[PDB]
Write a protein that binds this ligand. Sequence first.
Ligand SMILES: Nc1ncnc2c([C@@H]3O[C@H](CO)[C@@H](O)[C@H]3O)n[nH]c12
Ligand SMILES: Nc1ncnc2c([C@@H]3O[C@H](CO)[C@@H](O)[C@H]3O)n[nH]c12
Lengths: 235, 230
Amino acid sequence: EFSMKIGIIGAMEEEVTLLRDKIENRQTISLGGCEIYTGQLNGTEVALLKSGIGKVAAALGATLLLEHCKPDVIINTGSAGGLAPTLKVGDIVVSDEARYHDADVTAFGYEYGQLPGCPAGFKADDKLIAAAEACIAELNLNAVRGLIVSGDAFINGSVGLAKIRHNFPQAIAVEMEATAIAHVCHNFNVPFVVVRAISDVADQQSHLSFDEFLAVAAKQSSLMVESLVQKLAHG
Amino acid sequence: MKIGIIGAMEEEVTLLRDKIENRQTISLGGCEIYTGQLNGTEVALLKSGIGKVAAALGATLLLEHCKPDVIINTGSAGGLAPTLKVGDIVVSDEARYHDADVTAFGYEYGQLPGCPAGFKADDKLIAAAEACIAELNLNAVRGLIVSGDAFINGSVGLAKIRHNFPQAIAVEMEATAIAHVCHNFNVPFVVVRAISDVADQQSHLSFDEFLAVAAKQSSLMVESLVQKLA
Ligand SMILES: Nc1ncnc2c([C@@H]3O[C@H](CO)[C@@H](O)[C@H]3O)n[nH]c12
Ligand SMILES: Nc1ncnc2c([C@@H]3O[C@H](CO)[C@@H](O)[C@H]3O)n[nH]c12
């Protein structure tokens, strides 16, 4: 305790800003097109990286963060399109696993979503998940735990969504960085957990919904992250 | 100067690895990096995994740890240009994701926010590559190479690529990711790959059958380019 460094990766300005503004003794390190904010969040040493959007940007960011700040665990936050029926805009999704919904080397006998040399899915850390569920209960928020899928496409209904629902009937949310981050953490053997807030249900109106509720998603994911850091650091 | 080289599969990396002298191996984030000299030239060879995230992670590591001057991404590819046959070379003048789609927000198809719609390869590296192609009498095509996390083997996947990028000369799985990373660091790059298949319904069989040829041809080309640059 007291010597834990918690890594946090968010892709977009909005939520990252709220967390960034709350960092004490904040400093900014700009690298490979990424900004990394170091300091403490309510006492806990954190390293917050604003990655770009997409798998590669997230991978590049996650790799840089691991390499230069060597955080003990990684928390990926931000928005996501809710897929589980009980999810409403603002609700929380916690990954117990992450899979690429757009990876496909099945022609070679790999499981759909699986890339060669990688497990079909990347498992989030049990302690981190439990911690997150603890915060969820304590904050009295509605949330769902389960499989989160990533791809380099903003899902907006039509075939994008149906294909995902068909390939991963159990997926609770879809977004664009989670699995890339999980993938990099897996390779570095670093525990991770994805804690995002719903900004849309990835249907025909996901773009306007995203546009109108990105703010609330940022508010709720940031609140959860702040709460998770605290709980991970103490109790 | 130091030439960075990234290949996804052991096949297209092993022949080069065997030729590197003053050889040392750095093993990080599940990636292997061999440094030393290829026929007198300082290089840094990285075996990345397959797919964009693995490539990005590896490219990021190579840049960060070895600081090469330029990056050469090598390996196999599915040929899309009519002139391409197994064993032939494709040289990128540009790389684009064929599976990135945020057009819902007004970005160009294949384009990811914060990035140009396409990443342009270095003109010098391109000219160098083509001088080798000419000197070795190889059949090659220069143009747009598109990358995604799916092995293309006809059907809907190939159709989607034809739709969005009818001018793409080849499809593979790491190029644009390496380009994207090189872009964030301002490192010139060039993709030089050999055709292992034509991304049709028979690409899996062709890939298995010709991956060996593709690796040797891409390997020979990297060797020649390295020497030409130096
Ligand atoms: N329905 C949806 N489809 C894809 N990505 C998202 C997102 C997230 O918001 C960004 C959209 O480009 C990206 O970082 C992604 O992780 N929210 N809702 C989404
Ligand atoms: N028809 C095709 N579709 C997608 N990738 C490839 C490739 C390349 O070979 C590997 C196939 O999984 C990968 O490294 C990729 O970059 N060759 N032919 C391909």
